[PDB]
Structure formats: C-alpha cells, structure tokens
Amino acid sequence: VAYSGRKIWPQKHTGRARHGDIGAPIFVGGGVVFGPKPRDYSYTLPKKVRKKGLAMAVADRAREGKLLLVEAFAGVNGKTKEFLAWAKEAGLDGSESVLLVTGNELVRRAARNLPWVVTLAPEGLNVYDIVRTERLVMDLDAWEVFQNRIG
Amino acid sequence: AKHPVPKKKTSKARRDARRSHHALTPPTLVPCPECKAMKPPHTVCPECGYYAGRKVLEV
Amino acid sequence: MFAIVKTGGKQYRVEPGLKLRVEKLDAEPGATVELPVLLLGGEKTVVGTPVVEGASVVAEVLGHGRGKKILVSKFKAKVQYRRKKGHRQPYTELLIKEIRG
Amino acid sequence: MEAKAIARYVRISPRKVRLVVDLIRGKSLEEARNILRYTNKRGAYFVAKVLESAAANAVNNHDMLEDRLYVKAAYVDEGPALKRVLPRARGRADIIKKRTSHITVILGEKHG
Amino acid sequence: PRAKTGVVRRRKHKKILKLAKGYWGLRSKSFRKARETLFAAGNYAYAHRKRRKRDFRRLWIVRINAACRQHGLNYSTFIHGLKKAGIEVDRKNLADLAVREPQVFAELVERAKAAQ
Amino acid sequence: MKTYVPKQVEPRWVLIDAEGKTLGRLATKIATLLRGKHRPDWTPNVAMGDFVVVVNADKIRVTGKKLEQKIYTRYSGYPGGLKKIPLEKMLATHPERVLEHAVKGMLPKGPLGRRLFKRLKVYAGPDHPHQAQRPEKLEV
RNA sequence: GGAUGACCCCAGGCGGUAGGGGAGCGUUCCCGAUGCCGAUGAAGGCCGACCCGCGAGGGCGGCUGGAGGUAAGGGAAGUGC
RNA sequence: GUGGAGCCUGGGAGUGAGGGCGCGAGCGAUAACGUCCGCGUCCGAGCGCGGGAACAACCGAGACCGCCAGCUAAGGCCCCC
RNA sequence: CGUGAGGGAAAGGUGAAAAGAACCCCGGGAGGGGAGUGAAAUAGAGCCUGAAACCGUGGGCUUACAAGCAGUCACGGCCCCGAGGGGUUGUGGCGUGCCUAUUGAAGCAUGAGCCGGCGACUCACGGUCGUGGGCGAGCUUAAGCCGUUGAGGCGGAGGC
Numbered sequence A: 001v002a003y004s005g006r007k008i009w010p011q012k013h014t015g016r017a018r019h020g021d022i023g024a025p026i027f028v029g030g031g032v033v034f035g036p037k038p039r040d041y042s043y044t045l046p047k048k049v050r051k052k053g054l055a056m057a058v059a060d061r062a063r064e065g066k067l068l069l070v071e072a073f074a075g076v077n078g079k080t081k082e083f084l085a086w087a088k089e090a091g092l093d094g095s096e097s098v099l100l101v102t103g104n105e106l107v108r109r110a111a112r113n114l115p116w117v118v119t120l121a122p123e124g125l126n127v128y129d130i131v132r133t134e135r136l137v138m139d140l141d142a143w144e145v146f147q148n149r150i151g
Numbered sequence B: 001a002k003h004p005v006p007k008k009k010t011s012k013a014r015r016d017a018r019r020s021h022h023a024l025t026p027p028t029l030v031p032c033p034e035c036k037a038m039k040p041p042h043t044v045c046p047e048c049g050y051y052a053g054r055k056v057l058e059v
Numbered sequence C: 001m002f003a004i005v006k007t008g009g010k011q012y013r014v015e016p017g018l019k020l021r022v023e024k025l026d027a028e029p030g031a032t033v034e035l036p037v038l039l040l041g042g043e044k045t046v047v048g049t050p051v052v053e054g055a056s057v058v059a060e061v062l063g064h065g066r067g068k069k070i071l072v073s074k075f076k077a078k079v080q081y082r083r084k085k086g087h088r089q090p091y092t093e094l095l096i097k098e099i100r101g
Numbered sequence D: 001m002e003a004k005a006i007a008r009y010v011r012i013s014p015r016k017v018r019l020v021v022d023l024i025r026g027k028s029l030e031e032a033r034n035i036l037r038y039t040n041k042r043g044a045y046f047v048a049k050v051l052e053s054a055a056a057n058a059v060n061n062h063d064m065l066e067d068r069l070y071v072k073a074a075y076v077d078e079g080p081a082l083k084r085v086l087p088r089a090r091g092r093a094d095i096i097k098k099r100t101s102h103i104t105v106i107l108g109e110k111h112g
Numbered sequence E: 001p002r003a004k005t006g007v008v009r010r011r012k013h014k015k016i017l018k019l020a021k022g023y024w025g026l027r028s029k030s031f032r033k034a035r036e037t038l039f040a041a042g043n044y045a046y047a048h049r050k051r052r053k054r055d056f057r058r059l060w061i062v063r064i065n066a067a068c069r070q071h072g073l074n075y076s077t078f079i080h081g082l083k084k085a086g087i088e089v090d091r092k093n094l095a096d097l098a099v100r101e102p103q104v105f106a107e108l109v110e111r112a113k114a115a116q
Numbered sequence F: 001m002k003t004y005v006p007k008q009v010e011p012r013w014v015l016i017d018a019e020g021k022t023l024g025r026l027a028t029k030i031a032t033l034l035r036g037k038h039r040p041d042w043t044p045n046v047a048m049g050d051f052v053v054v055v056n057a058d059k060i061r062v063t064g065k066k067l068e069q070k071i072y073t074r075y076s077g078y079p080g081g082l083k084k085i086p087l088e089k090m091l092a093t094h095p096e097r098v099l100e101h102a103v104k105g106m107l108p109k110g111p112l113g114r115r116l117f118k119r120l121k122v123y124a125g126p127d128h129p130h131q132a133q134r135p136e137k138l139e140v
Numbered sequence G: 001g002g003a004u005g006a007c008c009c010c011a012g013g014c015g016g017u018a019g020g021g022g023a024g025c026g027u028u029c030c031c032g033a034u035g036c037c038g039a040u041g042a043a044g045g046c047c048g049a050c051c052c053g054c055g056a057g058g059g060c061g062g063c064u065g066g067a068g069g070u071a072a073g074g075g076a077a078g079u080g081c
Numbered sequence H: 001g002u003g004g005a006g007c008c009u010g011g012g013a014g015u016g017a018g019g020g021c022g023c024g025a026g027c028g029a030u031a032a033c034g035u036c037c038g039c040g041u042c043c044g045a046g047c048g049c050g051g052g053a054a055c056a057a058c059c060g061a062g063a064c065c066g067c068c069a070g071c072u073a074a075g076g077c078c079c080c081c
Numbered sequence I: 001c002g003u004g005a006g007g008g009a010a011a012g013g014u015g016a017a018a019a020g021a022a023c024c025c026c027g028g029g030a031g032g033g034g035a036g037u038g039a040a041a042u043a044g045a046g047c048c049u050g051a052a053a054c055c056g057u058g059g060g061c062u063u064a065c066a067a068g069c070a071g072u073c074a075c076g077g078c079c080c081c082g083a084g085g086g087g088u089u090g091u092g093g094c095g096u097g098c099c100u101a102u103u104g105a106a107g108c109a110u111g112a113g114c115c116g117g118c119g120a121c122u123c124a125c126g127g128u129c130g131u132g133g134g135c136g137a138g139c140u141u142a143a144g145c146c147g148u149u150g151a152g153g154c155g156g157a158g159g160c
C-alpha cells in the first residue's frame, strides 16, 4: 500500500488506541488481509480421465439418439443460408442446440453465426462443448479422429 | 480540583425534564388608550407617542 | 348442565355449544369423539370417583391446527451460549355437542 | 385550506428559535404579531418574517383572509451545521457548531 | 471476487430492533442495547412460562382454601378427603366450582368429610 | 377455560373488638381480612378484602415481659436519630399505633399492600365513627 | 415394519466452557444464459398482526424506488461484526 | 453386567492458573476465605431450577420444546408467603 | 502539515432532454408561496436511491405516595383494526446488563457515547491422513511443441 511506515502517534499516553503505520488492515485505506493475488487455477487432469470422458460424453448423446454422423455437407460453401438449408434438410430446425464438428472451414463459417450452433474442428472436440449442447453432429472424418483420439 | 466530568450520558428523558422550566412567558401587553395598539404597560406608546393622556414623543 | 371432562392430561368445564382447543386428538376433522366425564353439575350433580360410568361428552372435531409461535430462547452470559427455537404446539378444535349424562 | 412559509438555513440555533416559535403556536395571526413584536429575542425577528410571509401567501395565493388567519402549525427543524474551530489552551482546537434552522409556519382560517 | 457486507448487516439489525419495539430509550433504539435487552427477555419468558404453572396453581389453592373454610374445614383436610374419596377433579376446576358453582363445591366438601 | 376474575365488588365492612385479644394473633387475622383471602374469589392484584374497624385497641394484650421490653423504633435520618419507644409507653401515648404497626408488617409491601393498610381503621376506646357503614361485628 | 431414506410404529438419549464432529442459511462472482424475470416496474429501501422453516432464513402483500435482476443443479471466495 | 461400555489403528484437539466442601495427613498456632499432598464430591462448564433471608461449589435435583393438569424432594404449613 | 528530507487527505451521480423554473406575491437578502417545465420536482440544482444514530411537529395510550439491568408472566382499563388481533400500561408475581478475563463478576475488575460503513484463520510449494474418481505391477508426466483464440492434444526427460 502507498503509505509511509511512520508510527502515527506514540505507543502510550496519548489517550488513543495504539497504532503503527496507517497501512495496517485495521485502517480504512489500509491494506487487505489475505486478499486475492494472481493465481493459476489450472491442474493436470489425468489423460485417461479426459480420454474416458471424451468417449462417455459422445456415448451419452449416442445413447439418446442425439448423435448424428454425416458424409459431407451438400451445398454449404460458406453461406449461412446455405448451411441453414442443409441443416433443415437434415433435421436441424434450430430448436435444439448443435455442436457441429467438422474439419471443413467452409462449413464452420456457414454455421458459426447461428445462435443454436457451436462449431469445432475435430481436434477441438471436448466434453464441456458436447455436454453444453443438445445434439452432436459430425463429419465422418471428424468422427474418425475422435475414434483415433479415444483409442 | 480534579476535573469533574459527567459519569453517564444524560438520557433524552432527563435532558428534556430539565427543560421543563425553559418555556418563555409571552410579553405582557396592554392596549394604548389613544391608538389601541398593543404595547407594554408603563411605557410610552411607540405607535402614537402618547403616555398619561398626552403626546410625549415624535413617532 | 355442565361437565368436567378430561382430555390431554388436562380437565375442562364444557357446555354444549362450546368451542375448545385441547391437545391434538388423533381423529379426522368432522369426526365425533367421546370425552370422559369427571363430574356433572347444573341441574343434577353427579360426582365421578374418578370418572362416572355412564357419562360421556360428545364432541365434534372442527379441525386440528398449530398455535401461534412462541420463541423459546436460551442465553447464558459469558459463555457464548445462545439458542433460538420456534415452537408451535399442535391442538385440536372441538365443538361440544351434548352431555350424555 | 392552509398557507405555509419556510425560511431555510436561517443561521440561528434550533433550540433558540423554537423557544420563540412556541410562543405563537395556535394563536391568532394578530396576537402572534403582537407577541413577536415585544418578544426580547433574536429569534423573534426570524419567526416574524416567516409568519408575515405565510400570511401574504394565505392572502395573495390561497384566497384566505387576513382577519381569519391563525398559526395552525409551526416548527423548527435543524439544518446542516457550520463547523468552526475554536482554539483552546495548550494547542487543542475545539469545534464550535454554528447551527442552522429551517423555520416553518402554517396558517389556517378560524371559521366564523 | 469481493463480498462486501452490503445489505446483510442492516437486515440483521432491523430484525432485532423490531423485536425490541416497546422497550425504553436506547433499548428500542440501539441494536446493541436491544439485543442485550432481548437475551434477558428470552430467558424471563422461558423461566416465566415455567412459573406461570406455579403462579396459577398457588392461586387455585388459595381460593379452594377460602371456599373450604366456609364449610368448616381447611385445604389440607379437603384434599386428603378427595384423595380418599377417589375424586380426581383438579385444582383449576375445584377453584372454578368454588366460585361459579357453590352447590357443587359443597357436595364435594361433603364427600370429603365423609370420605375420612 | 381461564380462571375466573371478579368484576368490581362492593367491599364489606367488619368490626372487631380488640379488648383482651393477643396482639400478634389478632393481627394475622386482620391481615387476612385485609388481603381478602377468606374470599373464594381472591385475586392478588386488586384490593378486594374487607374494611376492618377495630375498637378497644388500647386494651390489646401481650404475653411475657413485652410491655417493658418490646421496643418500637424510628430512624430520623439525622445523626443520633434512632428513637426507641417501649410498648408500655406507646400504649400510654398512641395505643392505636400498636395494632396498627403490627398489622402493617403483616401486609405485602408495594402499592397494593399500602392501599390495604388504608382500609384498616383502628380505634382506642369502645367507639368508632363508621356507623354510616353499618360494620358487621365479627368474632375472630 | 418398507425394503433400502418414502413414511408409520415402539423405545431410549438430547445441561454444557475449552474443544472434536455433523447438517444447513445467507453474501460476491462463474457455468446454466444469444436463455429467463423486468416500466402492467429490476435492485435497493420502508411497513406487515400473513405463509413456510427448529433456526440462520425464505415467501407473499402494501408503500417507496426507477433499471436492472437472475432459477433447478453445480463451481469459486476479499463471504456474515 | 449390551453400556455415549471396553479394546485396537489412525485424524483433530483443548488442558497442563483451579476452587469450595467432606474425610485422612503434613506444614501453620489442635490460626486463616491459609498452605501442601491423598480419596471423594461439587463449582469450573449446572452464576439453569427448589430450599438455605440474600449467596459458584451446604441440602434437593442433572433444565429437548409446549400445557391456566397430577405426585413428590430438600425445606416448609401464624401473617408477609 | 513540516525548517527540511518528508508526510499527505477529502471530494463521483438533476433529468431522456436544461425544458435549470419567465412573471406575480412576502422578504434587505437567503428563503419560501403561486405560476411554469417534466413521466416524475420530498428529480430544484444544499439535486438518483436516500438506511441508522440524532432533532422535531401532530396523534393514541400512560404518568406527580413512587424504589428501577427497565424486562418478563398474569389480569384488568383505555385506544385501534375488524369467541380474534394490535398499541398502551395500572396492579400483582418473578428478575444481579453485554463482552472480556478469572478459582470466582451485577460486580466497586477490562472494553464500549450512539449509529452506519471498514475490520482478523488465507495463499503457494512441500508433507500427512481422510475422502470422490481414473488406471493398476504399474501409475504419472515437467519444461516445451502443435493446435485453439474461453478447444484441446503432443511431449516418458523425470518422479513415485
């Protein structure tokens, strides 16, 4: 804190309480006791746990019928209306949130602005995103790497 | 002496009880028989300048 | 004609037409229950020894409820012992119907 | 119907003026005028101004009649105090509060 | 993140202050004196609801005694007679009879002399 | 059912001839009458006992050597201010005080007890002024 | 008892300082949230003799206020005088 | 003898100023509301309740909450009561 | 403030918009009362909200023979909202503040004028036990690298 270390008034005989300097946490203006300092919240969760987790999350959607694999994306060439068309045609009316996973940059841009769509490259697939969304949609090529990842 | 000092704060009831005698009494006034303006008895009237039937002073 | 009945470890003077809160009876609202009589007075006097063989007072249960909350608080000085409990005593409301003397 | 006047931030101490205000609560406007005139206190000058201002309001704004006016309510509330240093022996400085009043007078008409 | 007192403490103090409505000077006005006053009161209440049970019983007894002695006996004799008669009417009631139903109290007195 | 509370009652006046009765044991009975504890509707927080008139107080009796030895006592608040007056003398100068002082000590302290003592009317000599009240002669 | 902490029944324990343990309440902030409540009135304040809760509290109502608030379930602390 | 008994392993303590009383001693003066040990008790922590005029440790008795019901304990029953 | 080195404050908010109140009235003025503006003016510039201590006006109940840790229990009176409640308190019963420290405090032992706000068991890294999970003769990666731009992965050196 910014203040000086001078003892503000003598220890005895002033009729007041004893104090040291005015930086002490007992003074308004003073320092804070055990407040926050810069902190690293991270930790290394076991790799097998992440692996097992990745798998189980997909598994959970699979078990709900909410996982859909797709061969390729028709006419989607980077336009939201294009993805939107395709999406409708594939049973995604936007009434359910979708984690769209594909390595196709053109398909990701096209879908990324939709409020109900979260998009990812297959290397990015992770459990918070799967669990956050109601429906999982993958390229086969996406699905291939995920299989390779949970192996 | 050794600096006496109140031992307890005086309660509002006590303070106000002490002021039970603090009310002003309103001025005692009588009419001036020449101009009928109220004034203190035994004073030359400041309204008209009369006292004891006569004109005592310019007002 | 009045009766002294005993319900709930307590005794009450009851006359037909009286509403009375007593300790909670295990009996559905609208049921009618029979109270013991320790004494009958009014026109004739009969004195139980302790209860009178034939008498009963017939009461209809209007309902069961909970008393207005009492705060039961405990405090002991200089020991930081403090406890605060809310209490509502269950009761049953009865209407006294007849005195079957 | 009532007419009121408030003098706010009058530089005099509430306890002092109230003593004067108390002399006129409930009185006819006329009696109140006489009383203030011959009341020997600083506060009389201030109460007198609020009274007369309230009277004017009664007559000019609120369609009330001077001959019927009486002090219906009157009170002194305390305003923000002026804090001032009063130097004492041995280097101590005391703090004198020069206090402040908000004086309210409220007139009604005494009917028939 | 920081969690400043904010609203919470004002809210505890009012709770206490409201319970202290009615008390004298600072006791209804200052949270501290309120609370102090309140500890006392929780204990008295507790203690006094215990003792109300006594307060009333002593009263019933004084009454029963007065009524007995109109019939030429005392409370101790009357109670023993009832015990021996097997009459279990409690004092709350003996006392009500003594005032509201004197013919009934008399018969009880009778039963009591007889029972001995 | 709540315990009964009497509505205001008209108070009974009673007359007691003190002649030859023993001071202390007459006193307790007077006290009872004053509290109202002969009444089956006794209530501790109101004055509902009898007014008591006592005559021939000067002819009260006392066992042992008390006339000589019982000392009544008064403290004036001044230095040296303890007066000791013996029974004999008190009887000889203000006899009604002897009964009065005894009964007073057998009443409760407090506002009510003080009030009850006012309901006691004690006279030396056989007569009293309370005829207007037609006091009921009481043997105790 | 029924199967499992659903709740009923019987019995017993339940003063407490240092202190061990358990279960909760509330404050700031995060996910929930591109959501939901909100000018037909956010938070905050002032009332309440009403409802729920053993309690810490939580509701509901009236007045004030005038633009924010934020669930179920979890997470993290500058968390209660 | 099934008890908030016991034993074993481990986690967390606090305490390491005691005090009155009875009994057994020492010290002291067959003194102290003295001091120091032993056995026990209570207060400590039961300054909660009844009695003892009042009163931590004497007598009675171990307060989960409620009742305008009953029986008792020590102590009491002439009035205060 | 201090000769000086040096110490070192407090102090934010009208309203969407100034539309920031022309003009009249009382007043020396300040201030107010009308008029006007505004959705709102106890948003009027001493301006959002506007708590509490503290001061006042008005009302209800109460109080001048009374003995008090200020309450509590009971009853009765009066006042209020409408077999009930609420406010008030006459009488009667009972009743030794809070915290601290102590063998022991109402204690004539400490601390506190009252109120509001600030105000004290945390964090890193190691350890030890317990606990929820993952894998299990095995478990685990560090720095870094790649990727992301609130996406994760690779990395076996090393450790147990």
Ligand SMILES: [Mg+2]
Residues within 6 Å of the ligand: A001, A002, A003, A004
């Ligand atoms: Mg510094």
Ligand SMILES: [Mg+2]
Residues within 6 Å of the ligand: A002, A003, A004
């Ligand atoms: Mg500096």
Ligand SMILES: [Mg+2]
Residues within 6 Å of the ligand: A001, A002, A003, A004, A005
């Ligand atoms: Mg510095």
Ligand SMILES: [Mg+2]
Residues within 6 Å of the ligand: A004, A005, A006
């Ligand atoms: Mg320094």
Ligand SMILES: [Mg+2]
Residues within 6 Å of the ligand: A004, A005, A006, A007
């Ligand atoms: Mg320095």
Ligand SMILES: [Mg+2]
Residues within 6 Å of the ligand: A005, A006
């Ligand atoms: Mg230094």
Ligand SMILES: [Mg+2]
Residues within 6 Å of the ligand: A011, A012, A013
């Ligand atoms: Mg010192």
Ligand SMILES: [Mg+2]
Residues within 6 Å of the ligand: A015
């Ligand atoms: Mg000092």
Ligand SMILES: [Mg+2]
Residues within 6 Å of the ligand: A015, A016, A017
């Ligand atoms: Mg100081």
Ligand SMILES: [Mg+2]
Residues within 6 Å of the ligand: A015, A016, A017, A018
């Ligand atoms: Mg100081």
Ligand SMILES: [Mg+2]
Residues within 6 Å of the ligand: A008, A009, A010, A011, A012, A017, A018, A019, A020
């Ligand atoms: Mg100092």
Ligand SMILES: [Mg+2]
Residues within 6 Å of the ligand: A018, A019, A020, A021, A022, A024
């Ligand atoms: Mg310091």
Ligand SMILES: [Mg+2]
Residues within 6 Å of the ligand: A005, A006, A007, A008, A019, A020, A021
């Ligand atoms: Mg220093």
Ligand SMILES: [Mg+2]
Residues within 6 Å of the ligand: A001, A002, A003, A004, A005, A006, A021, A022, A023, A024
């Ligand atoms: Mg410093």
Ligand SMILES: [Mg+2]
Residues within 6 Å of the ligand: A029, A030, A031
């Ligand atoms: Mg700071």
Ligand SMILES: [Mg+2]
Residues within 6 Å of the ligand: A029
């Ligand atoms: Mg600062």
